[PDB]
Amino acid sequence: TELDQTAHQSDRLNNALLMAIRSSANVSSGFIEQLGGHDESAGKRMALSVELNNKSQALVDEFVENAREPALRGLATELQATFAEYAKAVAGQREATRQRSLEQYFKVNSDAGNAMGRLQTLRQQLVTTLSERGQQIML
Amino acid sequence: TAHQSDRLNNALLMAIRSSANVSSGFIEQLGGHDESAGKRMALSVELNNKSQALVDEFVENAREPALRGLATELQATFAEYAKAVAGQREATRQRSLEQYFKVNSDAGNAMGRLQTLRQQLVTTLS
Numbered sequence: 001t002e003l004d005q006t007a008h009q010s011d012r013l014n015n016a017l018l019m020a021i022r023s024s025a026n027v028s029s030g031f032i033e034q035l036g037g038h039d040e041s042a043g044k045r046m047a048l049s050v051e052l053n054n055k056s057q058a059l060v061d062e063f064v065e066n067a068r069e070p071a072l073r074g075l076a077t078e079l080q081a082t083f084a085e086y087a088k089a090v091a092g093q094r095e096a097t098r099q100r101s102l103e104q105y106f107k108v109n110s111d112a113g114n115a116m117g118r119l120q121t122l123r124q125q126l127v128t129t130l131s132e133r134g135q136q137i138m139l
Numbered sequence: 140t141a142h143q144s145d146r147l148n149n150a151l152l153m154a155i156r157s158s159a160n161v162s163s164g165f166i167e168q169l170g171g172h173d174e175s176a177g178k179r180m181a182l183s184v185e186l187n188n189k190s191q192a193l194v195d196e197f198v199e200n201a202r203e204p205a206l207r208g209l210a211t212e213l214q215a216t217f218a219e220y221a222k223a224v225a226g227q228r229e230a231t232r233q234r235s236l237e238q239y240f241k242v243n244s245d246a247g248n249a250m251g252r253l254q255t256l257r258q259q260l261v262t263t264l265s
């Protein structure tokens with residue numbers, strides 16, 4: 001049944017990164033809605049961005065708990081540390097939205113992109129490692 | 140089955156990055172970063188073309204009747220998302236905040252459905 005446990009680890013990964021990117025999509029589009037005077041819609045996107053990054057970090061933390069094989073743990077905790085960096089930058093984008101400052105938005109939008117670029121590469125290496133472990137069981 | 144999951148997961152990650160880039164690009168236009176906004180727009184076009192190609196490969200390789208209806212639903216829902224993101228791009232080229240807001244709800248709801256659709260598709264891929 002360790003076979004179906006590598007699939008749960010892979011789905012936690014894919015869901016975490018998808019929601020992590022959806023959260024940045026919500027703050028940027030919410031920032032635009034705010035500049036158009038759509039305060040209510042912008043507030044809902046801020047809340048959705050909070051909820052998505054919290055859900056993603058919960059999956060990430062569940063991911064590193066169940067990653068016990070050392071061929072997997074080395075990439076797992078770098079994914080957690082990189083994500084905490086990504087989460088703070090998106091949180092910085094949200095406070096710039098509430099403050100209506102393009103200045104603060106550009107200040108941390110480069111941080112979010114850098115951490116997201118490393119998150120996507122870390123997912124690729126982790127997905128390959130999980131797929132390799134699952135295949136190792138069938139042979 | 141491994142190629143289908145890679146197509147599905149990469150298609151969705153690239154589709155959401157295509158949207159995040161046009162919103163980023165729109166914000167750069169508001170700040171006077173016209174050259175940097177053009178680079179976000181081009182990357183959004185490319186991510187959309189690549190994710191559309193993966194969705195097409197996925198649907199063609201999803202023949203087992205347990206997946207045929209779910210694959211077609213993914214295709215149509217993905218079409219709704221891409222159309223909205225294309226509307227985000229055209230609202231950006233016309234520098235219209237109101238046109239951006241109109242299509243933003245269509246993109247958010249479609250991607251919320253794609254998130255649940257992808258989960259159901261990979262459990263049927265087991």
Ligand SMILES: O=C(O)c1ccccc1O
Pocket residue numbers: 022025026029155158243246247248250251
């Ligand atoms: O994924 C979302 O929730 C979303 C929201 C607004 C715009 C584009 C999007 O993908």
